[PDB]
């Protein structure tokens, strides 16, 4: 549906040392997943009862300059990663 794209900026002026610095980045991204995306149907052929459900979920991806990512399902959990991802085995 309507992904939302949220940004962050920093802008800095040093007058003492005559230095300037700025930064714009895609910080948080929010999207909608179709209802078919997560569904359940159950058929009870003994009792002749059927049930169906489908529901949207909104997913969250957040990133940063200091290489930390954050993602998950809006309304449930977030998970945080330290980039570059450093597997264990």
């Amino acid at each position: 549906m309507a992904t939302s794209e949220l940004s962050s900026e920093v802008s800095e002026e040093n007058s003492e040392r005559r230095e300037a610095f700025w930064a714009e980045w895609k910080d948080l991204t929010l999207s909608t997943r179709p209802e078919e995306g997560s569904s359940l149907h159950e058929e009870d052929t003994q009792r002749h009862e059927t049930y169906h459900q489908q529901g949207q979920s909104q997913v969250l991806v957040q990133r940063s300059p200091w290489l930390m990512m954050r993602m998950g399902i809006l309304g449930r959990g977030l998970q945080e990663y330290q980039l570059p991802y450093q597997r264990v085995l």
């Binding site: 949220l6 920093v10 802008s11 800095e12 003492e16 230095e19 459900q53 489908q54 809006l74 309304g75």
Partner: protein
């Protein structure tokens, strides 16, 4: 100490929160003398008169703005400005406040039953959802709307269809469909009224 212009060692981040939740904007700033800081929402400065509730602190380079129970109005561009003699820095990030939704759920699904013609029949379901699902009843794919003989009524989240006087004609596959902006659920079960006639 050596003078140093204000600089974000860690800038603000954007914040997506659910309505009624706490929103926290925080940042780390360094510089000497320790900068003077101030927070803005959509370019206007923030105080408790514009954001009733906000807490806000700045100790050992920790800047922090927290909204206790965000509302959807609170969404916008939040900035932190830091100035001292040697210069100035701003960090800007967004708040997106979101509605708590929940797709339709049948806490109680319709159940299948047989009955003796003439008797009263209550077919009930319990449905949850935010926003409140629309609930509609069906027999063999045709919708039943409330009447004398088939009276629909909700009691909280309990929805019943009451067939005052069952007949064999009213046997069939009964469906409840609950729908809202974020999902659908439908429950079906079989109803058989028997009879006996010479």
């Amino acid at each position: 100490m050596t003078t140093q212009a204000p600089t974000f060692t860690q800038p603000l981040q954007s914040v997506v929160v659910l309505e009624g939740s706490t929103a926290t904007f925080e940042a780390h700033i360094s510089g000497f003398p320790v900068p003077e800081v101030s927070w803005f929402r959509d370019g206007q400065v923030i105080s408790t008169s514009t954001l009733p509730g906000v807490q806000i602190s700045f100790s050992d380079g920790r800047a922090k703005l927290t909204i206790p129970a965000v509302t959807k109005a609170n969404s916008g561009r939040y900035s932190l400005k830091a100035t001292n003699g040697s210069g100035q820095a701003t960090s800007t990030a967004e708040l997106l406040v979101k509605a708590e939704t929940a797709p339709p759920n049948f806490v109680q699904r319709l159940q299948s039953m047989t009955v003796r013609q003439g008797s009263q029949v209550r077919l009930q379901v319990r449905v949850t959802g935010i926003p409140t699902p629309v609930v509609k009843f069906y027999r063999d794919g045709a919708e039943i709307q409330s009447s004398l003989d088939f009276q629909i009524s909700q009691e909280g989240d309990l929805y019943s269809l009451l067939i005052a006087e069952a007949y064999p004609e009213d046997s069939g596959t009964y469906s409840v469909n609950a729908t809202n902006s974020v999902g659908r659920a439908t429950s079906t079960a079989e109803l058989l009224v028997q009879g006996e006639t010479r």
